[PDB]
Amino acid sequence: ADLEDNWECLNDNLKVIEKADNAAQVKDALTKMRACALDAQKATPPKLEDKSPDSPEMKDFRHGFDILVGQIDDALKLANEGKVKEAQAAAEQLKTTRNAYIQKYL
């Protein structure tokens, strides 16, 4: 229920998407990613407990999640049109956002 759990939820569902055979499986996993991303967005990461809630780093942290959620939405749109492989490729790129925006605060 904490950050770390929500982060590993992103990792597990990225694996679900990588291994998926159909669009419905990709949609389910992207749904879980989005829910976990929203919960993570509300946490205070271990690099920033001393900082003010409105600090530039905390801004960075939460905006990494707004960016991530928007990209999850873009992948969901692909999956909702049945474009499985396109949705899987979009999900791979979610890793680049996750790594560049959020990892440095964990």
Author numbering: 1 to 106
Show the paper's wording.
Previous studies showed that proper introduction of disulfide bonds could stabilize the flexible region of target proteins and reduce the conformational entropy by locking the protein into single desired conformation. Here we developed a comprehensive disulfide bond prediction algorithm that not just increased the success rate of predictions but also improved the quality of crystallized target proteins. We applied our method on two proteins which were previously determined to high resolution and frequently used as fusion partners for GPCR crystallization, cytochrome b562 (BRIL) and Flavodoxin, and verified our prediction by solving the crystal structures of the wild type (WT) proteins and mutants. The theoretical and experimental results both indicated that with relatively lower values of conformational entropy, proteins would be more stable and readily crystallized to higher diffraction resolution.
The continued disulfide omitted electron densities of the side chains suggested that the disulfide bonds are successfully formed in all crystallized mutants, which are T9C-A36C, A20C-Q25C, V16C-A29C, and K27C-A79C in BRIL and N14C-C93, A43C-L74C, and C102-R125C in Flavodoxin, respectively. Compared to WT BRIL, three mutants (T9C-A36C, V16C-A29C, and K27C-A79C) show relatively better or similar diffraction resolution, lower conformational entropy (ΔS) and comparable B-factor. These disulfide bonds are located near the middle of helices I and II (T9C-A36C and V16C-A29C) or between helices II and III (K27C-A79C), thus directly strengthened the linkage between these helices. The BRIL proteins with disulfide bonds T9C-A36C and K27C-A79C have lower entropy, consistent with better diffraction qualities. For BRIL proteins, the simulation B-factors are consistent with the experimental values.
